Design a protein around this nucleic acid. Structure first.
Lengths: 244, 222, 50, 138, 138, 152, 196
RNA sequence: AGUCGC
């Protein structure tokens, strides 16, 4: 505060759909006071206990039971940054574990689960306070959500079907910023469709709508992309300033 | 021979034992089998360059578990026993470690989530309180206060200032155990009023303080 | 984007004009470039003052 | 034979209550322990420097034999159990509970460099300037 | 409704993602983050904290110089389930009634609710008694 | 400011107390090249061998000679640092270094005040100083950049 | 309120030209009592006193909570009781097949020689950390309780999980050595994945 | 204090 230039003021790359790009004050506090994205959500926190039980039962070997002089090949697994154990087949584990998340044996909004292949680590997070956003799931080079789910959403006008049911189909997922680093994320159904040799075909998530990266005040401003970027920031202050 | 000696007979036989990891629910079921004399049977089927091990539960106890073999090369596992007769013996070496795999990991989970729920239920915070009016009834005094009053109201209260000689004897008796005491202790052991115990201690004795007004009195030892 | 994409779009350079509109990614990278301009105004203002 | 085709099947028993506690004694494979060369051993709780919580002291053969330290594992299992499957003269299997898991590790017969003297002081002076002679002056 | 067999038309356009987005706000709503955290804070955390591990015991001093015949009395205090009543207000008369947020602003009140806890008193002195235990809701 | 550290590809320390039967049989003809080099006190010089390999590309740019480097290091350290070098007729360039002692006085009088650290360990301090402090044509401390420009 | 993520080690290149790299771990029971615990493992560089070994740029020390003086990581391992240098090497780097990692630690082993038992090492940490107390044994017991309670508390709070802490401390040295080889990226200051 | 104005 008051005399210190720094890089935690400049919009960082990871703030994509996590925190509004252009909604931070124009005064000395610029960029330090940020504003949450529209689709952004924040994990409320949960006990790690169930995950630990499923892992030990699946095939995770306990720390003091293994032999240290034989672990180089093995992948280290952590839960809330606590090093719980080791594994010799992380690919079947990750695939199975996610399947459980889609099926809700562990809480979606909660568990973040990340694999860092080049380091052979598996980090899992269930602590409070992580920023995450909903995305569509794509599978076998195409979207997993089908128009029949839409017809239930139209039906909601007189039925109990809801966004929670939509999460229960496992067609949408919650992704925190640490996990968002390791996904291959298509911009829009259109692009994921035309693709043949256009770019790649390995996508795993897709954006529910790209204009969601904006925070509350930035959404009032129409055609924000035909404006010079700081121009959008002055409007986010002034819109908040108007009366009515 | 002594209890500090470790019997090597088992080790001296070079006896091998098997090490199997099992889920708590299966062993809890065994735990409530008690002494039926069995919990199941183990089946081993061997082929060319391959071995299959499995377990079947007792049908009575149920009212196929495949085995996965494990490396033991990286640890020299052995077993010892601590007897109820306080005798120690080295029973054998682990020649194999293994894991008991469930018949199905997937559906099980329904039971498991329910299973987790049964051990794990602190149904907390949980139900507001709608409203309450128990900021407590107002008696005439605390119930226990009345108990305190009753105690005070039982014999003890006034003290026996009469008979200086017996009280003199009591001081002499104090002087029979130790050279000095705290005046707080002196009133406790004598059951007399402080002003009077002082009046006597001025007459036949002296005082000696230490540190921060910590005082002891003595019947002039000589 | 895909890992290691030095090609001009994944790393900076916007093709469109303010009239055509910026694609979503183009839009966000532009906001990064606009922020430098906002921050520099505040930091420079204090230092010259002194 | 077992090298070609074989099948075995043995009943598994659990006694209602064992007459003794069953414990695990684990060694590092790197220590390559061979009990073939053990002839005597003593095993007693280190307790004098301050019982069932206290570490193990393993003393093999005579005083000049190797000594090891046994450290207790926090619990046998945190969500499971460990059981021993044993062969019996009738031809059955017998299964025994684990009561404790202990880690056992090697100790030097006689090393002891000690820092109580002024080794810490020598460290203040330590410019990596000596190594053998300090071990000799001991 | 689905079966993934006779279906051949997965395509779905702008018109439809907004249906999905609407359902997100219909379910969650714009401020959810604040509310979900506070709710979890009551539903979990204030319970977790009194359900900690600091049951306090107190033993007054006895046999102060003399003594003999037992009893330096001993008391232990334990805490149980926590209750929270909907936000109430007490007039100077002493009579409580429900508050409503509009009232709370006009008259400048604080919009809070009263918290109660189960407490236990427990005497297992040195011998004469042990069961005399009483539950309170305070 | 070019330090020997910039030019050096790699270093190695060997125990080779018998040059006439060196630990690298392939290195053996260069020992044949040096036997007239103080043959009397090879019984006196230390048995530890330092061997260095140099990058041809750095050596070309700095347009140096192996005799320039050898003369630089010997001059810089002093007479103690006994140097010999490989033949220029190779794409690779390697330098072999031994240390000479104080000869006559080393007869172990009181206890040889050195506190008897191993001579190799002294050699690593030599190599350390040798990498960082040696300044072949590095006439000053201008970090290590130098950019030439043509101005029109 | 935005803060730095607890329970996870990240590597930094701060200003102080005498610290080459440092590994930071903020380790509170963000569900216990909310203290802090800020273990630092710092790699010292630039120097070497005299003819020490020509290049001090590998003398890895450790800050610990409520310790008045920096101590080398190896003492803490001695204090955990793993006197066996091969075992400490096993906790630090479970791939002793690479000569370069083995050389990187070696001068830190060289420092370790002055202290060669758990008790005395405990007496070192006690006196380097606390107020003066010629009691020796209490200095050892208090320090024993600090290692038990204060260091990496997220990994445990008792004797019965004292081994588990040893791997994790060792993992930080490993996580640090990787950066020091440079085959590992230096971790950003402001990545949102590392925020709460 | 913080918010905020240029």
């Amino acid at each position: 505060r008051d005399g210190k230039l720094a890089k935690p003021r400049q919009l960082h790359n990871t703030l994509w759909g996590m925190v509004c790009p252009a909604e931070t004050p124009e005064g000395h506090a610029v960029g330090l006071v940020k504003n949450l994205a529209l689709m952004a959500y924040i994990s409320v926190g949960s006990q790690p206990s169930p995950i630990l039980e499923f892992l030990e039962e699946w095939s995770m070997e306990n720390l003091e039971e293994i032999s240290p002089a034989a672990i180089a090949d093995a992948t280290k697994i952590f839960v809330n940054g606590c090093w719980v154990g080791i594994h010799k087949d992380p690919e079947q584990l990750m695939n199975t574990l996610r399947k459980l998340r889609r099926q809700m044996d562990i809480i979606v909004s909660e568990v973040s689960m990340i694999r860092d292949i080049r380091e052979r680590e598996i980090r899992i997070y269930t602590d409070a306070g992580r920023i995450c956003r909903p995305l569509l799931i794509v599978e076998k080079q195409k979207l997993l959500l089908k128009k029949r789910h839409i017809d239930q959403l139209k039906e909601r006008e007189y039925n109990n079907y809801s966004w929670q049911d939509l999460v229960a189909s496992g067609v949408v997922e919650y992704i925190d910023t640490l996990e968002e680093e390791t996904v291959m994320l298509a911009m829009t159904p259109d692009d994921l469709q035309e693709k043949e040799v256009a770019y790649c075909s390995t996508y795993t998530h897709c954006e529910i709508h790209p204009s969601m990266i904006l925070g509350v005040c930035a959404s009032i401003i129409p055609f924000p992309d035909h404006n010079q970027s700081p121009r959008n920031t002055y409007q986010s202050a002034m819109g908040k300033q108007a009366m009515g | 021979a002594e209890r500090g000696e470790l019997d090597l007979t088992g080790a001296k036989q070079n006896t091998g034992v098997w090490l199997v990891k099992v889920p708590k629910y299966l062993s809890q079921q065994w735990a409530k089998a008690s002494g039926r004399g069995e919990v199941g049977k183990l089946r081993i089927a061997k082929t060319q360059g391959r071995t299959e091990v499995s377990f079947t539960l007792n049908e009575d106890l149920a009212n196929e578990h495949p085995f996965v073999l494990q490396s033991v090369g990286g640890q020299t596992l052995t077993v010892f026993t601590e007897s109820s007769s306080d005798k120690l013996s080295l029973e054998g070496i682990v020649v194999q470690r293994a894991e008991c795999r469930p018949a199905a990991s997937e559906n099980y989970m329904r039971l498991k989530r329910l299973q987790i729920e049964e051990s794990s239920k602190p149904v907390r915070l949980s139900q507001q309180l709608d409203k309450v009016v128990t900021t407590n009834y107002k008696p005439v005094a605390n119930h226990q206060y009345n108990i305190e009053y009753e105690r005070k109201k039982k014999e003890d209260g006034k003290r026996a200032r009469a008979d200086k000689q017996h009280v003199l004897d009591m001081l002499f008796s104090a002087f029979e155990k130790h050279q000095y005491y705290n005046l707080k202790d002196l009133v406790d052991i004598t059951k007399q009023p402080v002003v009077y115990l002082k009046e006597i201690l001025k007459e036949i004795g002296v005082q000696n303080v230490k540190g921060i007004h910590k005082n002891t009195w003595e019947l002039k030892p000589e | 984007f895909i890992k290691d994409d030095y090609g001009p779009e994944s790393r900076g350079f916007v093709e469109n004009s303010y009239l055509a509109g910026l694609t979503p990614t183009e839009f966000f990278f532009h906001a990064m470039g606009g922020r430098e301009g906002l921050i520099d105004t505040a930091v420079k203002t204090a230092e010259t003052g002194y | 034979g077992p090298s070609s085709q074989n099948v075995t099947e043995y009943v598994v028993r659990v006694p209602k209550n064992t007459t003794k506690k069953y414990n695990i004694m684990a060694f590092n494979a790197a220590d390559k322990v061979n009990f073939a060369t053990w002839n005597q051993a003593r095993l007693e709780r280190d307790l004098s420097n301050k019982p069932e919580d206290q570490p193990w002291l393993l003393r093999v053969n005579g005083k000049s034999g190797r000594k090891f330290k046994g450290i207790k594992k926090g619990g046998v299992t945190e969500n499971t159990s460990y059981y021993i499957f044993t062969q019996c003269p009738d031809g059955a299997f017998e299964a025994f509970p684990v009561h404790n898991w202990y880690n056992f590790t090697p100790l030097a017969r006689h090393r002891t460099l000690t820092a109580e003297e002024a080794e810490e002081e020598w460290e203040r002076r330590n410019k990596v300037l000596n190594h053998f002679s300090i071990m000799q002056q001991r | 409704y689905d079966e993934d067999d006779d279906e051949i038309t997965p395509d779905l356009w702008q018109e439809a993602c907004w249906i999905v987005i609407s359902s997100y706000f219909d379910e969650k709503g714009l401020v959810r983050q604040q509310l979900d955290s506070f709710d979890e804070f009551i539903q979990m955390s204030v319970q977790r904290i009194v359900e900690d591990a600091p049951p306090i015991d107190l033993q007054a001093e006895a046999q102060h110089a003399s003594g003999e015949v037992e009893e330096p009395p001993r008391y232990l205090l334990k805490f149980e389930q926590i209750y929270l009543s909907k936000p109430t207000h007490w007039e100077r008369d002493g009579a409580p009634s429900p508050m409503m947020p509009n009232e709370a602003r006009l008259r400048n009140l604080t919009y809070s609710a009263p918290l109660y806890v189960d407490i236990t008193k427990t005497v297992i002195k040195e011998g004469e008694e042990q069961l005399q235990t009483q539950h309170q809701k305070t | 400011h070019t330090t020997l550290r910039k030019v050096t590809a790699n270093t190695a320390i060997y125990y080779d107390p018998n040059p006439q039967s060196t630990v690298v049989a392939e290195d053996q003809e260069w020992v044949n090249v040096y036997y007239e080099m103080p043959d009397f006190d090879v019984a006196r010089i230390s048995p530890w061998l330092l061997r260095v390999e140099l990058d041809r590309k750095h050596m070309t740019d700095r347009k140096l000679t192996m005799e320039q480097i050898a003369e630089k290091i010997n001059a810089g350290f002093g007479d103690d640092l006994n140097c010999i070098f490989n033949d220029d007729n190779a794409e690779k360039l390697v330098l072999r270094i031994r240390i000479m002692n104080s000869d006559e006085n080393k007869m172990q009088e009181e206890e040889e005040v050195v506190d008897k650290m191993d001579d190799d360990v002294f050699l690593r301090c030599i190599e350390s100083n040798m990498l960082t402090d040696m300044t072949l044509q590095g006439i000053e401390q201008i970090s290590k950049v130098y950019m030439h420009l043509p101005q029109t | 309120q935005e803060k730095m993520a607890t329970n996870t080690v990240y590597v930094f290149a701060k200003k102080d030209s005498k610290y080459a790299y440092t590994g930071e771990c903020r380790s509170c029971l963000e569900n216990s009592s909310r203290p802090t615990s800020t273990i630092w493992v710092s790699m010292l560089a630039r120097g070497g006193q005299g003819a020490k070994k020509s290049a001090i740029g590998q003398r890895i020390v450790a800050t610990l909570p409520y310790i008045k003086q920096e101590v080398p990581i190896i003492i803490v391992f001695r204090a955990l009781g793993f006197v066996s240098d091969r075992d400490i090497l096993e906790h630090i780097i479970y791939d002793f097949e690479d000569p370069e990692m083995m050389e990187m630690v070696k001068p830190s082993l060289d420092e370790a020689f002055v202290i060669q038992e758990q008790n005395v090492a405990l007496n070192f940490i006690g006196s380097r950390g606390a107020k003066p107390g010629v009691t020796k044994e209490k200095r050892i017991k208090y320090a024993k309780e600090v290692l038990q309670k204060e260091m990496l508390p997220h990994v445990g709070v008792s004797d019965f999980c004292e081994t588990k802490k040893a791997y994790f401390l060792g993992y930080m040295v490993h996580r640090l050595l990787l950066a020091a080889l440079g085959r590992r990226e230096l971790d950003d200051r402001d990545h949102y994945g590392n925020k709460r």
